[PDB]
Amino acid sequence: GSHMKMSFRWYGKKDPVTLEEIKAIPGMQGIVTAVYDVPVGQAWPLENILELKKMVEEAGLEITVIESIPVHEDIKQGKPNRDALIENYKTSIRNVGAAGIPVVCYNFMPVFDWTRSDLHHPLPDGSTSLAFLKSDLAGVDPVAIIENYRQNISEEDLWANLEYFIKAILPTAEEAGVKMAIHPDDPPYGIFGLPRIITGQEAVERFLNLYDSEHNGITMCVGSYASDPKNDVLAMTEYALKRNRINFMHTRNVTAGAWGFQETAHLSQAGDIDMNAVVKLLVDYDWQGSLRPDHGRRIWGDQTKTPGYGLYDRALGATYFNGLYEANMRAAGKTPDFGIKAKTVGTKE
Amino acid sequence: SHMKMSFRWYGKKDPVTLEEIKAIPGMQGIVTAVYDVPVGQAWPLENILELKKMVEEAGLEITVIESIPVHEDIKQGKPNRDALIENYKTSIRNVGAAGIPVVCYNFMPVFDWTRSDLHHPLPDGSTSLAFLKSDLAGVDPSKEEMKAIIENYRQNISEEDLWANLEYFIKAILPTAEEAGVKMAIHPDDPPYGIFGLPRIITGQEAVERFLNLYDSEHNGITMCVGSYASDPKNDVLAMTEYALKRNRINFMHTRNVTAGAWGFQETAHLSQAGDIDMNAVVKLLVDYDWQGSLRPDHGRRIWGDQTKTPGYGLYDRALGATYFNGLYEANMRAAGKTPDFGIKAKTV
């Protein structure tokens, strides 16, 4: 039966936003984080991981998702030395299972993790936000790897590069008891001459099939998939739930059509995603995992640099999912839990 | 069946600005008062228009007026009351004379509310307002004038007197309010039971009916503050809310959360499982009855190093309140078949 742990992203010691503050978000249970002192491709030690955990748990919370044991471009590129990098991935996996963290979250997106044309695009209310202006700048080389991809490696070269990968790590993932969750490409389509393959329903279906197991699931990031209208998140989310292969939810809204795309407040009505439908769906399928609001607007004096990762609107995101998850739970004769063990401290009757 | 999510604003001197109040997803209405005519004297249109103007330019409207204060002398049924009830008559005239459809007021001797502690700690390390009975047991509440206003109430005004003093006031001002199109909504007493041997009468289901009945008319309404009434365990807010809804008698909604006991009470996060009120059931009611007027999340906790010193009127947890209600509303409207709505014209500029 259902079990959704409201979660927040936290970059660790050097985060603008603190655990004190994250904890104050009504219903917050999971911290979604990573090790940041180990170079990409290089293998996370247990101590790095337990350091983060000790901090997070003292704050009165738990790490429920490692967001991103990063994939070395060499691996993505399909270069001969991959196995070396892959064996390191296997260690990091083994190490996270060792810390008791249920899920690992990763992308297979070549040289770029995300693309945004404007980082302060105005919205109909004064708040800024990020957008992808299909017009602006677009159609210019970003000023060796890129040319490699552009020239040689096809999408199906990437499909085989990727299957090699997940075929290498999955048994390790299984023994650690860690659920992999592949993060869609963002935007979910070819740019810059680079290829993207994790982009829609057909790909989620081919990907899961790469290695048929729950240890091999997706991170349903509705705002990424829906950054291309060619995509319908609802049937995608459902297909994926019907199949038991969502291991992580992100839940940011986005407005889109043929013109490009722009991130908006989480509220279904502010963008093109019916967020109620999304969580109603998480409800009826007794989904068990974690959800993060993910990405916000710049509202108020918001001084967090690091892009959509300011506290305020992301917090205003979780409490909206609080209302959505709770109302839908009740509607179905289901009793919602938010992990509150005490209303008060020291008073009581 | 359209509920206009609103938010209280204190005029030009508020550290919370409308730029900020505007940025909360779905926020439409503002809730405000005039703060320069001393109390029982008349409210000049010059003073109200210039607040609407300040509001209407920021994208928001004035949806409801949080308090033209009834003067003590009116409440005490003193002889000089008619002069004061006069000014109050016009106050009602000027407000209708400026589009704003709801005036909210109270009938609570001596105090507008009483707490014992404005930084009581909660389990998540944040602080919130509490009223601890056992901590106000010791206390004995102009400064030398209040003394004998209390004495007057204590000794010479019984509940039934105060009921009669309210009766007068009501049939005095109620025609005026039907003549200006303004709807009166009375706040529950907070706490909803006597303290310091001072009477309170707007305290529960009984009071509601009797009050409603002084003037069986849709302009004679309550502000249904679930939190105020839920501060007494003896009360069933879900029943009281429904009761008042069948009579078309809700002219405003406050949706603050408390946890109560024989011990007193404390304000909590708006979220249900954090307090004692099932907000979902509340808004479900509001929905199931096609209610119309504005809802105001109330009293937020004190989180994220907020410094604003007014009661529970920082921006943050009040804002986290509102978008929790967005989610609770939306999810309920769809669970019915109705379609929700927020301030929302353009997704993008």
Say yes or no for a CB contact (<8 Å) between A124 and B283.
no
Q: Tell me the nearest-neighbour CA distance from B25 into chain A, angstroms.
A: 6
Which residues in chain B have Cβ-Cβ distances shorter than 8 Å to A135?
none
Do residues A124 and B347 make contact, with C-beta atoms less than 8 angstroms apart?
yes
Q: Which residues from chain B sit within 8 angstroms of residue A321, using beta carbons?
A: 327
Contact between chains at A125 and B334 (C-beta distance less than 8 A): no
Which residues of chain B are within 8 Å of residue A123 when distances are taken between CB atoms? Answer: 348-349
Residue A294 near residue A221, CB atoms below 8 Å: yes
The DSSP output letter for B189 is P
The alpha-helical segments, DSSP class H, found in B157-249 are 159-179, 205-213, 226-230, 237-246
* Probe site for chain A from B323, B333, B342 (most A CB atoms < 10 A): B323
Beta strand ranges found along A172-224 (DSSP E): 179-182, 216-221
* Partners of residue A317 in chain B, C-beta under 8 Å: 323
* Alpha-carbon distances, residue B112 vs B15, B67, B106, B191 (angstroms): 22, 11, 8, 10
The answer to whether residue B187 is catalytic is: yes
Separation of alpha carbons B190 and B188, rounded Å: 6
**Is-catalytic flag, B254?**
yes
Q: Judging by beta carbons within 10 Å of its beta carbon (0-12, 13-18, 19+), is residue B56 exposed, middle or buried?
A: middle
Distance from CA of A342 to the nearest CA of B (A): 6
Q: Given CA atoms B283, B288, B289, B291 in this order, what sign does their dihedral have?
A: positive
Tokens of B77: 């049924």
Looking up tokens 């049939």 gives: B171
Size of interface A-B (CB pairs under 8 A): 183
- Selected residues 241-300 of chain B with any CB under 8 Å from a CB in chain A: 259, 261-264, 266, 268-276, 280-281, 283-284
Most A CBs within 10 Å, among B304, B338, B339, to test the A interface: B304
With residues binned 3-state (H G I as helix, E B as strand, rest as coil), the percentages for chain A, rounded to 5, are: 35, 15, 45
The H or E element spanning position A242 is: helix A233-242
Burial B294-323 (b: 16+ CB within 10 A, else e): bbbbbbbbbbbebebeeebbbbbbbbbbbb
Structure tokens that stand for B92 in this block: 């009602």
What is the tally of structural domains in chain A? 1
Which residue range is the domain that position A47 belongs to?
1-349
**Inter-helix orientation angle B45-56/B81-96, to 10°:** 30
Cα gap B297→B158, rounded to integer Å: 33
**Cα A24 to Cα A173, A194, B220, B339, distances in angstroms:** 33, 41, 39, 32
Task: Compute the half-sphere exposure of residue B320: CA atoms within 13 Å on the CB side of its CA.
Answer: 30
Rg (C-alpha) for chain A, rounded Å, is: 20
From chain B, the residues in CB contact with A6 under 8 A are none
DSSP code, position B307: -
Largest CA distance in chain A: 72
Alpha-carbon distance values, A289 to A79, A170, B163 (Å): 34, 19, 55
Q: Strand B257-261 and strand B264-268: pairing?
A: antiparallel
Distance between CA atoms of A57 and B255, rounded to whole angstroms? 32
Question: Which residues lie across from B170 on neighbouring strands?
Answer: none
Q: Do A347 and B22 touch (CB under 8 A)?
A: no
d(CA B56, CA A253): 28
Task: Return all residues near A57 (Cβ < 8 A) that are at least 6 apart.
Answer: none
* Contact residues on chain A for B24, CB-CB shorter than 8 A: 299, 316
Whole-angstrom Cα distance, residue A297 to residue A288? 28
Cα–Cα dist A237/A40, whole Å: 30
DSSP category for residue B224: E
> What six digits make up the tokens of A17?
């936003």
Contacts of A271 in chain B (CB under 8 A): 347
Q: Residue A252: beta bridge partners?
A: none
How far apart are alpha carbons A294 and B181 in whole angstroms? 45
How many Cβ atoms are within 10 Å of A170's Cβ, its own excluded? 18
Can you tell me the distance from the alpha carbon of A32 to that of A293, in angstroms, rounded to the nearest whole number? 11
- A292 - beta bridge partners? A250
Q: Residue B23 is encoded by which pair of tokens?
A: 């940025």
Per the listing, tokens 């969750």 go with A181
Q: Which helix (H) or strand (E) holds A103?
A: strand A103-106
Closest CA to A313 of A328, A293, A332, A327: A293
- Range A135-168 burial, b when 16+ CB lie within 10 A, else e: eeeeeeeeeeeeeebeeebeeeebbebbebbbeb
Is B297 in contact with B287 (CB distance < 8 Å)?
no
Residues 182-211 of B with CB under 8 A from A: none
Catalytic one of B190, B232, B276, B298: B298
Q: Which residues of A touch B324 (CB under 8 A)?
A: 26, 319-320, 322-323
Closest alpha carbon to B93 in B71, B68, B72, B75? B68
CB contact under 8 A, B331 and A327: yes
CATH number of the domain bearing residue A254: 3.20.20.150
Are A227 and A132 in contact by the 8 Å Cβ rule? The answer is yes
Partner-chain contact A323 B327, CB within 8 Å: yes
- Are the beta carbons of A320 and B323 separated by less than 8 Å? yes
Tell me the sheet residues that pair with A63: A31
Gap from B26 CA to chain A (nearest CA, Å): 8
CB-based burial label for B152 (10 Å; 0-12, 13-18, 19+): middle
Closest partner residue to B328 among A264, A316, A327, by Cβ? A327
Cβ contact B165:B76 at 8 Å = yes
Q: Which segments within B192-306 are labelled E, that is strand?
A: 220-225, 250-254, 257-261, 264-268, 295-296
* Catalytic positions of A: 183, 221, 250, 294-295, 309
Provide the angle, in degrees to the nearest 10, between the axes of the packed helices A233-242 and A275-284.
Answer: 10
Q: Which of B80, B64, B85 is nearest to B166 (CA)?
A: B85
SS3 A286: coil
Cis check: omega of the bond before A187, within 30 degrees of 0: yes
Partner residues linked to B11 by β-bridges = none
Q: Which of residues 13-32 of B touch A (CB under 8 A)?
A: 19-20, 22-26
**Residue pair A170/A208 in contact by the 8 Å Cβ criterion:** no
Asked how this structure was determined, the answer is X-ray
CA torsion angle B274 A99 A224 B326 (round to 10)? 0
Helices (H), B71-143: 72-75, 81-96, 133-136
Place of tokens 């038991």: A244
Measured CA to CA, the distance from residue B139 to residue B132 in angstroms comes to 12
- Tell me which DSSP letter residue A220 carries: E
Q: Is residue A341 within 8 angstroms of chain B, CB to CB?
A: yes
Euclidean distance between CA atoms A216 and A244, whole angstroms = 10
What's the one-letter identity of residue B91? S
Residues 107-126 of B with CB under 8 A from A: 121-126
Kindly state the helix (H) or strand (E) to which residue A41 belongs, with its residue range: none
C-alpha distance from B340 to closest chain A C-alpha (Å) = 9
Helices (H), B112-202: 133-136, 144-156, 159-179
Residue A26 with chain B: CB contacts under 8 Å: 124, 269-271, 274, 320, 324
The angle formed by the CA atoms of residues B118, B122 and B123, to the nearest 5 degrees, is 170
* Nearest to A217, CA basis, from A195, A239, A235, A232: A239
CA distances for A239 relative to A4, A163, A205, angstroms: 19, 21, 9
Assess A347–B contact: CB distance below 8 Å, yes or no. Answer: yes
Q: Cβ of B331 under 8 Å from any chain A Cβ? A: yes
Q: Residue type at B40? A: G
In Å, how far is A273's CA from the nearest CA of chain B?
Answer: 12
Report the gap between the CA of A140 and the closest CA in chain B (Å).
Answer: 26
Chain A interface mutation, best of B116, B124, B287, B295, highest count of A Cβ atoms under 10 Å: B124
Contact B332 A327 (CB under 8 A): yes
In whole angstroms, give the CA distance from residue B231 to residue B234.
Answer: 9
Chain B positions touching A255 (Cβ under 8 A) are: 347-348
Q: Which amino acid is at A8?
A: F
Residue in chain A lying closest to B345 (CA): A124
φ/ψ of A289, rounded to 5, equals: -175, -155
